[PDB]
Amino acid sequence: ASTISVKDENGTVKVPKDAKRIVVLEYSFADALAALDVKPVGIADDGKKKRIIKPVREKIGDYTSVGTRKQPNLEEISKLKPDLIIADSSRHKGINKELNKIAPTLSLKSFDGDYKQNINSFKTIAKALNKEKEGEKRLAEHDKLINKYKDEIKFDRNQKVLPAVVAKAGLLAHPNYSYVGQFLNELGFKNALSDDVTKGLSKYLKGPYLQLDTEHLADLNPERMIIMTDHAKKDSAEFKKLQEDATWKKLNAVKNNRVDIVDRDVWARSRGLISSEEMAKELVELSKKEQK
Ligand SMILES: [Cl-]
Numbered sequence: 001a002s003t004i005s006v007k008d009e010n011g012t013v014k015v016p017k018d019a020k021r022i023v024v025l026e027y028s029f030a031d032a033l034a035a036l037d038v039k040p041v042g043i044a045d046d047g048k049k050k051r052i053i054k055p056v057r058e059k060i061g062d063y064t065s066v067g068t069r070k071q072p073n074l075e076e077i078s079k080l081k082p083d084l085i086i087a088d089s090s091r092h093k094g095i096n097k098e099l100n101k102i103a104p105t106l107s108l109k110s111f112d113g114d115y116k117q118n119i120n121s122f123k124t125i126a127k128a129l130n131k132e133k134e135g136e137k138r139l140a141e142h143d144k145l146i147n148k149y150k151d152e153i154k155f156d157r158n159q160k161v162l163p164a165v166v167a168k169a170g171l172l173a174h175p176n177y178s179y180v181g182q183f184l185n186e187l188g189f190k191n192a193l194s195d196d197v198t199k200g201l202s203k204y205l206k207g208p209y210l211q212l213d214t215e216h217l218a219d220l221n222p223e224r225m226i227i228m229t230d231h232a233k234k235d236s237a238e239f240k241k242l243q244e245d246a247t248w249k250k251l252n253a254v255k256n257n258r259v260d261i262v263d264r265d266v267w268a269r270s271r272g273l274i275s276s277e278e279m280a281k282e283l284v285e286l287s288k289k290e291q292k
Helices: 028-035 054-060 074-079 096-102 116-126 132-152 177-184 195-199 216-219 237-243 265-270 273-288
Strands: 003-008 011-016 023-024 084-090 105-108 161-167 170-174 211-212 224-229 260-264
Touching: 003 105, 003 116, 003 195, 011 105, 023 074, 023 105, 028 054, 028 116, 028 265, 028 273, 074 096, 074 211, 084 096, 096 105, 096 161, 105 260, 116 177, 132 273, 161 177, 161 211, 177 224, 211 216, 224 265, 237 273, 260 265, 260 273, 265 273
Parallel strands: 023 084, 084 105, 161 224, 224 260
Antiparallel strands: 003 011, 161 170, 170 211
């Protein structure tokens, strides 16, 4: 057994050179494999086929679900007898010992990784699978496409942007160092949540995100909002109570038609090359709609 030594979040991992059958425990890792022409044999898809973004889903074809990302089914992982497991360095610390009994396991950033960190995980996966050259070519293609979309997004970058999900009668905002915040910065946007602003709102942190009630949204008053929801729906009970609020109606982004509701699976959960390409493409389309 020859191996390839790579670094992951726990140190060195010796990956067998014959690794072909791979179980992945986050969506970004499934994108990484598909980009490299590898079909994972198992995926923690939360029991929802639609959670794997369409172009990735269709490329991979049939696979076996190993259950939720929160609590993967180790019986199902062990039954697959994989060559390699790719686990999330934040989600899967608890099961790491058990996973290592089953197969060589890489522990890589996804859930707690920003845009660049997710890219890096992709690079580690490419190296682990003796596909470094293929990964370089794919990433050069990706970067060229992202920059092409950047140039095609017509929005005025001086309109500061707030990316957020809906939570508890307000917005749970993704700050400038989040995956979404950093990606928007890559596209030349200015996050409304500057470092100073976020410092001044930190008593409202809930882990990685900032809870903003309508009072604090009104104070921030970002020129643009991107609200990520399941199925890109805007008629949930929570969001409707928010949209009915008097302070909401006075917001600069609301009055001026600069609030866009986008798909949470694509924008927040996927964290892949294909999904970030689709996020950028969507911004181009939105920016080209009848100005009105
Ligand atoms: Cl997620």
